[PDB]
Amino acid sequence: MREIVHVQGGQCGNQIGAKFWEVISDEHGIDPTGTYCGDSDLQLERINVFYNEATGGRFVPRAILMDLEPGTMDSVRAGPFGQLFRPDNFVFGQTGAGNNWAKGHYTEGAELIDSVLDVVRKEAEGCDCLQGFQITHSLGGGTGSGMGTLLISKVREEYPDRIMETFSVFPSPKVSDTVVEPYNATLSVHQLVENADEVQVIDNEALYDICFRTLKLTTPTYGDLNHLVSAAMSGVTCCLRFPGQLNSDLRKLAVNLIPFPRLHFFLIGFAPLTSRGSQQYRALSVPELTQQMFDAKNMMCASDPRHGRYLTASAMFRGRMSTKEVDEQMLNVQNKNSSYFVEWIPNNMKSSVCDIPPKGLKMSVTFVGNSTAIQEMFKRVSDQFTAMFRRKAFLHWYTGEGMDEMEFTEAESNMNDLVSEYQQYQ
Amino acid sequence: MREVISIHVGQAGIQIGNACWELFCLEHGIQPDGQMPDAFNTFFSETGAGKHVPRCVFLDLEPTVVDEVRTGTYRHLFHPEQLISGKEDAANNFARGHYTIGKEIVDLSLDRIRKLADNCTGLQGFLMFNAVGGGTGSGLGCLLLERLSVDYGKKSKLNFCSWPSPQVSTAVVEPYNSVLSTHSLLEHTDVAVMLDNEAIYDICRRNLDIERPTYTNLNRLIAQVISSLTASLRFDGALNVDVTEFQTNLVPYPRIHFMLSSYAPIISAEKAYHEQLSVAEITNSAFEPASMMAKCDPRHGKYMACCLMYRGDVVPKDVNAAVATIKTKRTIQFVDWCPTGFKCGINYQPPTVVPGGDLAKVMRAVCMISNSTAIAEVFSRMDHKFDLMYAKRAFVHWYVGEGMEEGEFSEAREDLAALEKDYEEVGI
Amino acid sequence: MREVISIHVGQAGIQIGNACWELFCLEHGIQPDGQMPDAFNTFFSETGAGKHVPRCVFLDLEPTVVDEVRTGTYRHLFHPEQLISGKEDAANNFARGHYTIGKEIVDLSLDRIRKLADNCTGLQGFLMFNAVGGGTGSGLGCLLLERLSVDYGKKSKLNFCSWPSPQVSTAVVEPYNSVLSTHSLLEHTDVAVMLDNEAIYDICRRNLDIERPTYTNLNRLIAQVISSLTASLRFDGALNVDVTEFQTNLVPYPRIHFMLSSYAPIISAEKAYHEQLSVAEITNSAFEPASMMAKCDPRHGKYMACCLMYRGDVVPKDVNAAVATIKTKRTIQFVDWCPTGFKCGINYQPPTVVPGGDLAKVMRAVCMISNSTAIAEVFSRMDHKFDLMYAKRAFVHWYVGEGMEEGEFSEAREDLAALEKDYEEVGI
């Protein structure tokens, strides 16, 4: 049928991907041993999208784990749902790119990339005919940003016509891990604009805001943040895995979202999100759900959507629900919030209904929106990049391992024009 | 002997066809297996020991809509190669459904259609069900109609289009999809009926008082219209008409074959208790502008031709009295050069009710199919919305890079512009 | 064929209509469903398999009184669209009911009335029920009447106004609403009957001997008057009277169409046992000033015209014997220019008693509608009360701020002053 090959790169990508396989396996009813339990036909009818039969009855994920450091991949294996993956699909590195984009892309990543290309071709070609890839990584680190995006370049050259969706966490706006964030981010974006088909932006500070103000969790760990991102990642591929009244695949979402080929950066949201206290007090219905979906407080990028215009947005609803309220609420938002939508695209909103809700909830929605408010982040990290590059700070940890001066200027030029093009349609 | 072949293309075509074939099975009293415990021969084939298989093909590029029919209650109703599936979706792209992933499925589809049409020559025609705003419903709809036109040249081809609504769309690329489809529906279909989604939404809100209808309650209403349309072919009546005489009676000029629909009464168990359903009153409700099923107010248009299908305990003298009242009423406008603006048709068998559905048992019903000059608004609004999108070439790179040439947008636009001038010139 | 349309506007109109329609259903023997287990054609329609739906519309701006009818026992007697509800109350303002909120509901009201009036020609007239002292009964009641006057010109329009009492008010701003309504029901109403609350209160205290009746006991008595008025349309009689023949016989000049009521006998089960209910004595009790239904003593008036509707086992010879005694009695006096001041009607069908109600089963009854010059006092009392209120401009800011201008108070006052002088000039 249609198949998605999963690639998890870097420490962030592995730990966000580990919880993704937790949430998908539970949704399809796979035991951590790999066996099926749950006696329902709809769970198993579309399982080849993410799993492979192993002639012993067991299902193995089509996932490739990639890092340059052996530590964090051992942690994923040792944890629960860690015995699910095939041991050959783990590709280690020994030395590790110490938060260096240059050593992740040019020097240290180069002797590993041949090995990860072997394993991704083995899984990709082995079926009938592939639908796409999904890559989860970070654009702050070394191995997630450097060799993660090298894989994107190599697999686009091998499979040119297939879609390639990437879940990237951006650098945080105010306070920052890994002091060379803007060097890693700007160098990764300029060839992720030319090699990736749809790119979905996550910020850690937006996730912290959600876990404080909406979920009211006192101590959110990385376990809880990754669970939220995994919920949204499962919602975008609801339609592939379950039937629905109005079906919409990943390429259906791509054609409906991106008006011009350069701009394919999306904001992700999830609803409903209530505290344990307020679970029993809240109305679950379509009009309430669309109101939480169109909130700045619920978006997983910390960029205020009210400062720009939604060029086009899409809402993948899940659950047994009536399609008039799916239609009329999307009309309601365009009439009420007239100023926040662009005028030369009529009916900017796209709706899709999948009939199987996530476990425990009667109804849920994932929001993917192509907004021109994403220029606030591209401007911000460009200014942080231009502040450090004028004085040539931390440059010879990139210059020394074969990345010359001209590619930094090209990276800034290729990203400043992206800011300008968003202003063009504002 | 005489039969009709149904083609369902796209997700909307299949799910409307699911409702259509559930009604047809219950009306002729066949079980989901396909055996009843020669009036039905126009829709079902005899296959050995009392067993009947429908004369339909299901075509979609997505497997996710057809597989549930393969595994549902109606697994063994359909012949397994009448349900044809591709591998990847058209993904709201006319160019995908027409050029790239088109040729792999249409060859298999034409093989099934040829085997189904060569059983008893003298077949009436083709019914095509599709969504105009979609990818495969528009793209594969063009390609299959081109191939059917070349092979079965002298044939009637009726199309039931789920046209996009003026306000609600549930896609963004539908101004592109609709104008490109209408170029290929103009030269390749014989009679097209426009059905709108929000028209059936508001019919279900006022007449049935369902505030939250799903796609299933829209499809039941569509199925009742098609059953009443083909009731004359299946059952005996006082004044019957087949599908060939629709073209003679509704299409005055070759390009003007766009038709509206209305069905009356559509009443629940709360309202059927309190209404008399006289032939005079159900025909008054049929011509009422908010009971039209296309969201196109006919007050600002002139009726070119109108065709009324009465079904049930209807005497022909009450039909003649009821149509006379309509002519004398001044709120409708007929065109001056069509004095005999009506075709009447009477069938004996009352409309069938699906158990556990939302309609009530009615003793008599009317289905109205009308040609009017009010259709100028429904094409001019889509003409406007394509102009906004194409102003600076939004969403074009998905079409043009993926196999069709820049300029087919312009050629389709001038064809739609020619259709607008044609409707204006006829109404003078 | 021959029917009348009932309009109920305001809370008082609805609750009086509730008692009216309970009596009409029980006398013609239809159940609350609407199916009986051509006499009913003047009030009820035919809807399919033996079901009958009333020809009435219920109008209020405040939803509480119409929701409670829609959820009660009589849910499916009424058509769901015949009970029209607003969102917010008129709140004792003529200005609100006429100008601000009133216009949003009148369009929906006229649509229902047009559909109900187009069923047959020879529509006999319209019966309107409203409270003069209220907001929506006065404001929206007037507004409906301009639109009815322009459309249905020649059709008779009878009004039953629940006039404010001399002493009891239950409202403070109702002198303003009453004078404004009376100005605007002069030119929009053919026949107006005044029903007063304290007149029914003291009739129930002396005749039926109930010390604590409520509004539902008032409404039963009102329902008996309307049933006796329209008994000749529904049933056969010895000498029948139509509704167009009331205005010919009781209105001498266009501006005098304000009449009283009386009904006799209204006796309980313990008193009916002891009374011989002769035609002579029930007509003596009808003309008795303490049995009148407006609280307006006719001893200081002159009867201009009188209409007597006998109902039951009444022979025409006892009518002639009884009315001769009335003419010869000197405490009741007639005007000099009207020598024959009587219209008599006899109907066969005896009055029907509601079970659990407080009237007794009687073999004969009289309903009397009389025009007199005693109406000068009932306009004079509000003319005193309106002048007191308006002298230092109280409660006017509620009207003026809401959309009517200052000066319609002045115009209404001078029109009422003109009406007082007209009644005085006729009686000379």
| Ordered DSSP codes for C131-158 | ESSSSTTTHHHHHHHHHHHHHS-SSEEE
Collapsing DSSP to helix, strand or coil, A202 comes out as strand
Structure tokens at B49: 């020991």
Q: Specify whether the CB–CB gap between C44 and C9 falls below 8 A.
A: no
φ and ψ at residue B188, rounded to 5 degrees? -130, -10
Amino acid at the residue C232 = S
d(CA B82, CA B70) in angstroms, rounded, equals 11
A323/B87 touch (CB, cutoff 8 Å), yes or no: no
d(CA B84, CA C187) in angstroms, rounded, equals 74
Question: Minimal Cα–Cα distance from B282 to chain A, Å?
Answer: 27
Q: Specify whether the CB–CB gap between A184 and A139 falls below 8 A.
A: yes
- Work out the number of other CB atoms within 10 angstroms of the CB of residue A357: 18
Structure tokens at B12: 């909307």
Question: Minimal Cα–Cα distance from A9 to chain B, Å?
Answer: 28
Amino acid at the residue A71 = G
Question: Minimal Cα–Cα distance from A138 to chain B, Å?
Answer: 29
Place of tokens 């009911």: C97
Q: Specify whether the CB–CB gap between A284 and A363 falls below 8 A.
A: yes
Q: Smallest Cβ distance to C47: which of B209, B270, B276?
A: B276
State how far Cα C88 lies from the chain centre.
26
Structure tokens at A229: 């991102």
d(CA B425, CA B421) in angstroms, rounded, equals 6
C46 labelled binding-site residue: no
Q: Specify whether the CB–CB gap between A168 and A199 falls below 8 A.
A: yes
Q: Residue C319: CA atoms inside 13 Å, Cβ hemisphere, count? A: 21
Q: Specify whether the CB–CB gap between C352 and C26 falls below 8 A.
A: yes
Comparing alpha-carbon positions, the chain C residue that sits nearest to B209 is C80
Q: Smallest Cβ distance to B65: which of A247, A328, A345?
A: A247
Q: CB contacts < 8 Å between A and B, how many? A: 106
* C333 backbone φψ class: left, alpha, beta (φ>0; ψ -120 to 50): beta
B46, containing H or E segment: strand B44-46
Collapsing DSSP to helix, strand or coil, A169 comes out as strand
Question: What approach was used to elucidate this structure?
Answer: cryo-EM
Structure tokens at C191: 């026949």
- Long-range contacts formed by A388-397: CB under 8 A, 24+ apart: A388/A182, A388/A183, A394/A179, A394/A180, A394/A183, A397/A100, A397/A102, A397/A180
Comparing alpha-carbon positions, the chain B residue that sits nearest to A320 is B214
Structure tokens at B261: 């629909």
Structure tokens at A324: 């008039």
Helices (H), C28-138: 64-70, 94-95, 103-117
For chain B, count helices (H), then strands (E).
16, 12
**Contacts of residue B397 in chain A, CB cutoff 8 Å?**
260-261
Residue among B230, B223, B156 at smallest CA distance from B195: B223
Q: Smallest Cβ distance to C79: which of B272, B274, B276?
A: B274
Which residues neighbour A347 within 8 Å (Cβ) at sequence distance 6 or greater?
A334, B167, B168, B169, B171, B172, B174
- Chains touching C by CB (3 or more pairs below 8 Å): B
d(CA C399, CA C310) in angstroms, rounded, equals 45
Structure tokens at A52: 């492979």
Structure tokens at C336: 């000099």
d(CA C382, CA C175) in angstroms, rounded, equals 6
Residues linked to residue B194 through DSSP beta bridges, in sequence order: B161
C170 labelled binding-site residue: yes
Mutation target to probe the C interface, by most C beta carbons within 10 A, among B205, B208, B267, B273 is B273
- Work out the number of other CB atoms within 10 angstroms of the CB of residue B358: 18
B198 touches A at CB < 8 Å: yes
Q: Specify whether the CB–CB gap between B126 and B158 falls below 8 A.
A: yes
B141, containing H or E segment: helix B136-151
**Contacts of residue B200 in chain A, CB cutoff 8 Å?**
none
Amino acid at the residue C9 = V
Amino acid at the residue B216 = T
A1/B87 touch (CB, cutoff 8 Å), yes or no: yes
d(CA B234, CA B218) in angstroms, rounded, equals 24
- Work out the number of other CB atoms within 10 angstroms of the CB of residue C406: 11
B276/C80 touch (CB, cutoff 8 Å), yes or no: no
d(CA B35, CA B19) in angstroms, rounded, equals 19
d(CA B312, CA B363) in angstroms, rounded, equals 6
Question: Minimal Cα–Cα distance from B331 to chain C, Å?
Answer: 14
B270/C53 touch (CB, cutoff 8 Å), yes or no: no
d(CA B171, CA B175) in angstroms, rounded, equals 9
Binding-site residues on chain B for chain C (CB distance < 8 A): 209, 270-277, 363
Asked about B81 being catalytic, the answer comes back as no
State how far Cα C113 lies from the chain centre.
19
Place of tokens 């067993």: B51
In chain B, the N- to C-terminal Cα span, in Å, equals: 44
B67/A255 touch (CB, cutoff 8 Å), yes or no: no
B11/A247 touch (CB, cutoff 8 Å), yes or no: yes
A421, containing H or E segment: helix A406-424
Q: Specify whether the CB–CB gap between C97 and C104 falls below 8 A.
A: no
Resolution for this experimental structure (Å): 9.3
CA dihedral sign, ordered C81, C82, C83, C88: positive
B273/C51 touch (CB, cutoff 8 Å), yes or no: yes
Comparing alpha-carbon positions, the chain A residue that sits nearest to B63 is A1
Q: Specify whether the CB–CB gap between C211 and C277 falls below 8 A.
A: no
φ and ψ at residue A365, rounded to 5 degrees? -145, 145
- Long-range contacts formed by A87-94: CB under 8 A, 24+ apart: A88/A119, A89/A63, A89/A64, A89/A65, A89/A119, A89/A123, A90/A65, A91/A64, A91/A65, A91/A66, A91/A115, A91/A116, A91/A119, A92/A67, A93/A67, A93/A68, A93/A69, A93/A143, A94/A70
C71 labelled binding-site residue: no
Q: Specify whether the CB–CB gap between B224 and B24 falls below 8 A.
A: no
Residue among C71, C45, C68, C72 at smallest CA distance from C56: C45
Q: Specify whether the CB–CB gap between C168 and C218 falls below 8 A.
A: no
**To 5 degrees, how large is the angle CA B393–CA B396–CA B397?**
115
Place of tokens 């695209």: A345
Place of tokens 């799916």: A326
Q: Smallest Cβ distance to A256: which of B92, B201, B389?
A: B92
Question: Minimal Cα–Cα distance from C43 to chain B, Å?
Answer: 15
Rounded to 5, what percent of chain B is helix, strand, coil?
Answer: 45, 20, 35
Q: Specify whether the CB–CB gap between A96 and A131 falls below 8 A.
A: no
| Beta strand segments in A209-309, E | 265-271
Residues linked to residue B45 through DSSP beta bridges, in sequence order: B53
Comparing alpha-carbon positions, the chain B residue that sits nearest to A331 is B168
Q: Smallest Cβ distance to C48: which of B209, B270, B275?
A: B275
d(CA C12, CA C90) in angstroms, rounded, equals 14
| Burial of A60: CB neighbours in 10 Å, binned 0-12, 13-18, 19+ | middle
Collapsing DSSP to helix, strand or coil, C265 comes out as coil
Helices (H), B296-396: 316-328, 376-390
- Work out the number of other CB atoms within 10 angstroms of the CB of residue A37: 9
Mutation target to probe the B interface, by most B beta carbons within 10 A, among C35, C45, C47 is C47
Q: Gaps in chain B (C–N > 2.5 Å) come after which residues?
A: 37
Four-point Cα dihedral C379, C385, C390, C396, nearest 10: -90
A161 touches B at CB < 8 Å: no
B170/A328 touch (CB, cutoff 8 Å), yes or no: no
**Contacts of residue A330 in chain B, CB cutoff 8 Å?**
168, 170
Which residues neighbour C122 within 8 Å (Cβ) at sequence distance 6 or greater?
C1, C2
A324 touches B at CB < 8 Å: yes
Place of tokens 């440059």: A395
d(CA B254, CA C143) in angstroms, rounded, equals 52
d(CA B182, CA B160) in angstroms, rounded, equals 13
A262 touches B at CB < 8 Å: no
Using CA atoms, how far residue C136 sits from A314, C100, C216, in Å, is: 47, 11, 20
C48/B270 touch (CB, cutoff 8 Å), yes or no: no
d(CA C260, CA C282) in angstroms, rounded, equals 17
B395/A41 touch (CB, cutoff 8 Å), yes or no: no
Give the per-residue SS3 of C369-385: EEEECCHHHHHHHHHHH
Amino acid at the residue B413 = R
Structure tokens at A145: 């940003």
Structure tokens at B375: 């259709």
Residue among A420, A388, A402 at smallest CA distance from A171: A388
C11 labelled binding-site residue: yes
d(CA C44, CA C233) in angstroms, rounded, equals 13
Place of tokens 């209808």: B213
| Burial of C94: CB neighbours in 10 Å, binned 0-12, 13-18, 19+ | buried
- Work out the number of other CB atoms within 10 angstroms of the CB of residue B384: 11
**Contacts of residue C46 in chain B, CB cutoff 8 Å?**
276
B271/C80 touch (CB, cutoff 8 Å), yes or no: yes
Amino acid at the residue B203 = I
Residue among A76, A94, A80 at smallest CA distance from A12: A76
Q: Specify whether the CB–CB gap between A271 and A298 falls below 8 A.
A: yes
* B189 backbone φψ class: left, alpha, beta (φ>0; ψ -120 to 50): beta
A327 touches B at CB < 8 Å: yes
Residue among B300, B306, B346 at smallest CA distance from B326: B306
Q: Which is catalytic among the residues C22, C27, C146, C245?
A: C245
Residues linked to residue B325 through DSSP beta bridges, in sequence order: none
B11 labelled binding-site residue: yes
φ and ψ at residue A6, rounded to 5 degrees? -95, 130
Structure tokens at A333: 């938002």
